Design a protein around this ligand. Sequence first.
Ligand SMILES: N[C@@H](Cn1oc(=O)[nH]c1=O)C(=O)O
Ligand SMILES: N[C@@H](Cn1oc(=O)[nH]c1=O)C(=O)O
Lengths: 259, 261
Amino acid sequence: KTVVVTTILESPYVMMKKNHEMLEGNERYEGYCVDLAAEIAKHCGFKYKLTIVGDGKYGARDADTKIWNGMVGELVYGKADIAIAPLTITLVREEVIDFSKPFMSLGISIMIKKGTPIESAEDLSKQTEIAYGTLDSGSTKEFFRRSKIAVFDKMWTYMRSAEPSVFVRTTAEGVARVRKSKGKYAYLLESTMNEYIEQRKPCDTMKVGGNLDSKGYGIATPKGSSLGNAVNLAVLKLNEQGLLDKLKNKWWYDKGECG
Amino acid sequence: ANKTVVVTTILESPYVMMKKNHEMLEGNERYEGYCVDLAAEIAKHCGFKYKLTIVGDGKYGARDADTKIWNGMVGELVYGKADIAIAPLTITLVREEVIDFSKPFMSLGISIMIKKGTPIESAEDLSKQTEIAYGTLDSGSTKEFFRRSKIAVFDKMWTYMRSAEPSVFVRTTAEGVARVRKSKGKYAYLLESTMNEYIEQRKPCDTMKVGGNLDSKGYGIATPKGSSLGNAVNLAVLKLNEQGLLDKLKNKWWYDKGECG
Ligand SMILES: N[C@@H](Cn1oc(=O)[nH]c1=O)C(=O)O
Ligand SMILES: N[C@@H](Cn1oc(=O)[nH]c1=O)C(=O)O
């Protein structure tokens, strides 16, 4: 049986190849997770079909309906057999789906328009001139909503009531907002996307401060899936062979169009 | 029928260390450290009583080629001598094949420790010279890394280390640190970044971590394959990290009382 892989269009993990309109199937995409999927499948011995998550979200649980959306939802409801994307390993998710050991490390970080008067999260919380938000339906937003740390708590109180909305539908939108806000908007996103955007034209953004936390991305499968074991061992072998580092260098620093 | 959980761990600073008056203390009270605190937090969150026991052979864990017998903490789990391992045990493929690991509670990578002033800033530097000797810890993931690497530079380093005389391998991290400190810069030690940065903050502040890490991995809490404690332990680790506890514990044992400024 062909394995259904749910993923999300997020640079440089999964992107549409140039001329993708005349391409079909898996050949339409390119990126770190596209290469990763190939390696995993190769090591686990299964054929697969890449599909972009329907609602374009990562995965959150609606406090009301208590339904899961994004990639997490597709795994939970049997729409997909596995998730191969920059999906953050978290407690709430781990309670409904399984995660392989992490294939990449990261932490929430700050992205600013070059020249912006901000060096840390604490800075952002002390001022009101510069707005700041996060992605929706993701682990970053949850981070602030559940944080009991003074600074983060303060930032959350501000963000959930900010007007206009400081939350964005996609990372691209958060980035575009920073670039077009003349420094009046700072975006909170994972260090991985941050450092990637940092090395791309027009090279007008940069990462400031340390990471707010430390965690990783994991390949996810429906709770109690037979693929779980082989996938986990595959991630470990790939990391030990140095493949994960090669892929990281290939989609991140190689083609460094910035200075 | 709830029973006291046997925790195998290892005397490795600052994860597990003997308290000052350890001889006036008994049981778990004899020890202090990052993993001692971690054990308490996990036990609390999972609701179990435990007994900390230092691994007999003082090794992390390796499979003897030929007899296929595992030693160290990994062996304690495999042969049922312990119920769980709470220590800086590196999550690796060969180990995950015989025991279970929770998600990472700490991140690290192999690194280089030098005596200050030593003319080395990378693994490549080490591989192109013979004046400065270098080695790793025995029965661990670092030695296995070089032994199994297909990467040119690392293969070259392993080829040199495995046959150097006298032996460049040490039985304990402490022995490796001593060798770096007393060898006038003629010895460089390969060890995990975590131990490296801890030592860098200890007197007499004569060692330094140089270059980036050779890899990126983590430490996990290990349990015998199929253990019932597995699930709860994994979740506990995740909750602790999200609460910021783990970041707090590392600063406590690494920097809060650093001895080098
Ligand atoms: N990897 C995140 C998605 N997301 O990307 C960011 O940069 N922030 C954020 O929430 C997830 O798995 O929910
Ligand atoms: N955590 C390592 C033990 N060890 O510590 C080092 O610094 N190198 C090394 O092999 C393991 O689990 O085998």
